[PDB]
Coordinates of all heavy atoms in Angstrom, one line a residue:
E130 N 35.9 15.1 -9.3 CA 34.7 15.2 -10.1 C 33.5 15.2 -9.1 O 32.8 14.2 -9.0 CB 34.6 14.1 -11.1 CG 35.7 14.1 -12.2 CD 37.2 13.7 -11.6 OE1 37.3 13.1 -10.6 OE2 38.2 14.1 -12.4
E131 N 33.3 16.2 -8.4 CA 32.4 16.5 -7.3 C 30.8 16.6 -7.8 O 30.0 16.8 -7.0 CB 32.8 17.5 -6.3 CG 32.6 18.9 -7.1 CD 33.1 20.1 -6.4 OE1 34.4 20.2 -6.2 OE2 32.2 20.8 -5.9
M132 N 30.6 16.3 -9.0 CA 29.3 16.2 -9.6 C 28.5 15.0 -9.0 O 27.4 15.2 -8.6 CB 29.5 16.0 -11.1 CG 28.1 16.1 -11.8 SD 28.3 15.9 -13.7 CE 26.5 16.0 -14.0
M133 N 29.2 13.9 -8.9 CA 28.6 12.7 -8.2 C 28.4 12.9 -6.7 O 27.5 12.3 -6.1 CB 29.6 11.5 -8.5 CG 30.8 11.6 -7.7 SD 32.2 10.4 -8.2 CE 33.4 11.0 -7.1
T134 N 29.2 13.8 -6.1 CA 29.1 14.1 -4.7 C 27.9 15.0 -4.5 O 27.2 14.8 -3.5 CB 30.4 14.8 -4.2 OG1 31.5 13.9 -4.6 CG2 30.5 14.9 -2.7
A135 N 27.7 16.0 -5.4 CA 26.6 16.9 -5.3 C 25.3 16.2 -5.6 O 24.3 16.3 -4.8 CB 26.8 18.1 -6.3
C136 N 25.3 15.4 -6.7 CA 24.1 14.6 -7.2 C 24.0 13.3 -6.4 O 23.9 12.2 -7.1 CB 24.2 14.5 -8.7 SG 24.3 16.1 -9.5
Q137 N 23.9 13.4 -5.1 CA 23.8 12.2 -4.2 C 22.6 12.4 -3.2 O 22.3 11.6 -2.5 CB 25.1 12.1 -3.6 CG 25.5 10.7 -3.3 CD 26.9 10.6 -2.8 OE1 27.1 10.2 -1.6 NE2 27.9 10.9 -3.6
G138 N 22.0 13.6 -3.1 CA 21.0 14.1 -2.0 C 21.4 15.4 -1.5 O 20.5 16.2 -1.1
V139 N 22.7 15.7 -1.4 CA 23.1 17.1 -0.7 C 22.8 18.2 -1.6 O 22.4 19.3 -1.1 CB 24.5 16.8 -0.3 CG1 25.5 16.7 -1.5 CG2 24.9 17.9 0.7
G140 N 23.1 18.1 -2.9 CA 22.9 19.1 -4.0 C 21.7 18.6 -4.8 O 20.6 19.1 -4.5
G141 N 21.9 17.8 -5.8 CA 20.9 17.1 -6.6 C 20.5 15.9 -6.1 O 21.3 15.3 -5.2
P142 N 19.5 15.3 -6.4 CA 19.0 13.9 -6.0 C 20.0 13.0 -6.6 O 20.9 12.5 -5.8 CB 17.6 13.7 -6.6 CG 17.5 14.8 -7.6 CD 18.5 15.9 -7.3
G143 N 19.9 12.7 -8.0 CA 20.8 11.9 -8.8 C 20.7 10.4 -8.6 O 20.6 9.6 -9.5
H144 N 20.6 10.1 -7.3 CA 20.4 8.7 -6.7 C 19.2 8.7 -6.0 O 18.4 7.7 -6.0 CB 21.7 8.3 -6.0 CG 21.6 6.8 -5.5 ND1 22.2 5.8 -6.0 CD2 20.9 6.4 -4.3 CE1 21.8 4.7 -5.3 NE2 21.1 5.0 -4.3
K145 N 18.9 9.9 -5.2 CA 17.6 9.9 -4.6 C 16.5 10.0 -5.6 O 15.4 9.6 -5.3 CB 17.6 11.3 -3.7 CG 18.7 11.2 -2.6 CD 18.5 10.0 -1.7 CE 19.2 10.0 -0.4 NZ 20.7 10.1 -0.6
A146 N 16.8 10.3 -6.9 CA 16.0 10.2 -8.0 C 15.8 8.7 -8.3 O 14.6 8.3 -8.7 CB 16.6 10.9 -9.2
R147 N 16.8 7.8 -8.2 CA 16.6 6.4 -8.4 C 15.8 5.8 -7.2 O 15.1 4.9 -7.5 CB 18.0 5.8 -8.6 CG 18.0 4.4 -9.0 CD 19.4 3.8 -9.3 NE 20.0 4.4 -10.6 CZ 20.8 5.5 -10.6 NH1 21.1 6.2 -9.5 NH2 21.3 5.9 -11.8
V148 N 16.0 6.3 -6.0 CA 15.2 5.8 -4.8 C 13.8 6.2 -5.0 O 12.9 5.3 -4.8 CB 15.8 6.4 -3.5 CG1 14.9 6.1 -2.3 CG2 17.2 6.0 -3.2
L149 N 13.5 7.4 -5.5 CA 12.1 7.8 -5.8 C 11.6 6.8 -6.9 O 10.6 6.2 -6.6 CB 12.1 9.1 -6.3 CG 10.7 9.5 -7.0 CD1 9.7 10.0 -5.8 CD2 10.8 10.6 -7.9
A150 N 12.4 6.7 -8.0 CA 11.9 5.8 -9.2 C 11.6 4.4 -8.6 O 10.6 3.9 -9.2 CB 13.0 5.8 -10.2
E151 N 12.3 3.9 -7.7 CA 12.0 2.6 -7.0 C 10.7 2.6 -6.4 O 9.9 1.6 -6.5 CB 13.3 2.3 -6.1 CG 13.3 0.8 -5.8 CD 13.6 -0.1 -7.0 OE1 14.8 0.1 -7.6 OE2 12.7 -0.9 -7.5
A152 N 10.5 3.7 -5.5 CA 9.4 3.7 -4.7 C 8.1 4.0 -5.5 O 7.1 3.5 -5.1 CB 9.5 4.9 -3.7
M153 N 8.2 4.8 -6.5 CA 7.0 5.3 -7.3 C 6.5 4.0 -8.1 O 5.4 3.8 -8.1 CB 7.2 6.6 -8.0 CG 8.3 6.8 -9.0 SD 8.4 5.8 -10.5 CE 6.7 6.3 -11.2
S154 N 7.5 3.2 -8.6 CA 7.2 2.1 -9.3 C 6.4 1.1 -8.3 O 5.5 0.4 -8.7 CB 8.4 1.4 -9.8 OG 8.2 0.3 -10.5
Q155 N 6.8 1.0 -7.0 CA 6.4 0.1 -6.0 C 5.0 0.6 -5.5 O 4.1 -0.3 -5.2 CB 7.4 0.1 -4.9 CG 7.1 -1.1 -4.0 CD 8.2 -1.2 -2.8 OE1 7.9 -0.9 -1.7 NE2 9.4 -1.4 -3.2
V156 N 4.8 1.9 -5.2 CA 3.6 2.5 -4.8 C 2.5 2.4 -5.7 O 1.4 1.9 -5.5 CB 3.9 4.0 -4.4 CG1 2.7 4.7 -4.0 CG2 4.9 4.1 -3.2
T157 N 2.7 2.8 -7.0 CA 1.9 2.7 -8.1 C 1.5 1.2 -8.4 O 0.4 0.9 -8.7 CB 2.4 3.4 -9.3 OG1 1.3 4.0 -10.0 CG2 3.2 2.5 -10.2
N158 N 2.5 0.2 -8.2 CA 2.3 -1.1 -8.3 C 1.3 -1.6 -7.1 O 0.4 -2.3 -7.4 CB 3.6 -2.0 -8.1 CG 3.4 -3.4 -8.3 OD1 3.3 -3.9 -9.4 ND2 3.2 -4.2 -7.2
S159 N 1.6 -1.1 -6.0 CA 0.6 -1.4 -4.8 C -0.8 -1.0 -5.1 O -1.6 -1.7 -4.7 CB 1.2 -0.7 -3.5 OG 0.5 -1.3 -2.4
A160 N -1.0 0.2 -5.9 CA -2.3 0.5 -6.3 C -2.8 -0.4 -7.5 O -3.9 -0.5 -7.7 CB -2.3 2.0 -6.6
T161 N -1.8 -0.9 -8.3 CA -2.2 -1.8 -9.4 C -2.7 -3.1 -8.8 O -3.7 -3.7 -9.3 CB -0.9 -2.1 -10.3 OG1 -1.3 -1.8 -11.6 CG2 -0.4 -3.5 -10.1
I162 N -2.3 -3.4 -7.6 CA -2.8 -4.6 -6.8 C -4.3 -4.3 -6.4 O -5.1 -5.1 -6.4 CB -2.0 -5.0 -5.6 CG1 -0.5 -5.5 -5.9 CG2 -2.6 -6.0 -4.8 CD1 -0.5 -6.7 -6.9
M163 N -4.7 -3.0 -6.2 CA -6.0 -2.5 -5.8 C -6.9 -2.6 -7.1 O -8.1 -3.1 -6.9 CB -6.0 -1.2 -5.3 CG -5.0 -1.0 -4.1 SD -5.4 -2.0 -2.6 CE -3.9 -1.6 -1.6
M164 N -6.4 -2.2 -8.2 CA -7.2 -2.3 -9.5 C -7.5 -3.7 -9.8 O -8.6 -4.1 -10.0 CB -6.3 -1.7 -10.6 CG -6.1 -0.1 -10.4 SD -7.5 0.9 -10.6 CE -6.7 2.5 -10.2
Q165 N -6.4 -4.6 -9.7 CA -6.4 -6.0 -9.9 C -7.4 -6.5 -8.9 O -8.2 -7.6 -9.2 CB -5.0 -6.3 -9.5 CG -4.7 -7.9 -9.4 CD -3.3 -8.2 -9.0 OE1 -3.1 -8.5 -7.9 NE2 -2.4 -8.1 -9.9
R166 N -7.5 -6.0 -7.6 CA -8.4 -6.4 -6.6 C -9.9 -5.7 -7.0 O -10.4 -4.9 -6.3 CB -8.0 -5.9 -5.3 CG -7.6 -7.1 -4.3 CD -6.3 -7.8 -4.9 NE -5.9 -8.8 -4.0 CZ -4.7 -9.5 -4.0 NH1 -3.8 -9.2 -4.9 NH2 -4.3 -10.4 -3.1
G167 N -10.3 -6.2 -8.2 CA -11.6 -5.8 -8.7 C -11.6 -6.3 -10.1 O -12.5 -7.0 -10.6
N168 N -10.5 -6.0 -11.0 CA -10.3 -6.6 -12.3 C -9.8 -8.0 -12.2 O -8.7 -8.4 -12.6 CB -9.4 -5.7 -13.0 CG -9.9 -4.3 -13.3 OD1 -9.3 -3.3 -12.8 ND2 -11.0 -4.2 -14.0
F169 N -10.5 -8.9 -11.5 CA -10.2 -10.2 -11.1 C -11.5 -10.8 -10.5 O -12.1 -11.8 -11.0 CB -9.0 -10.4 -10.1 CG -8.7 -11.9 -9.9 CD1 -7.9 -12.6 -10.8 CD2 -9.2 -12.5 -8.7 CE1 -7.6 -14.0 -10.6 CE2 -8.9 -13.8 -8.5 CZ -8.2 -14.6 -9.4

């Protein structure tokens, strides 16, 4: 079932999509700290 093998970074992201999701949540959060650094 090489779907999981493909959807790992080599073909599709699949997990690289989860790595992004982690990072975009964190990066946007880091900017939320900037908003907060005003709305405080």
Side-chain angles (χ1 to χ4, degrees):
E130 294 76 19
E131 71 182 73
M132 183 177 180
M133 75 192 174
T134 308
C136 300
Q137 217 176 111
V139 69
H144 183 98
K145 293 307 194 296
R147 189 176 290 95
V148 173
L149 172 83
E151 199 63 65
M153 54 67 59
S154 182
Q155 197 180 111
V156 170
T157 217
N158 183 84
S159 189
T161 234
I162 299 296
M163 307 297 176
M164 296 289 179
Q165 172 188 106
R166 248 72 176 191
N168 300 116
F169 183 79

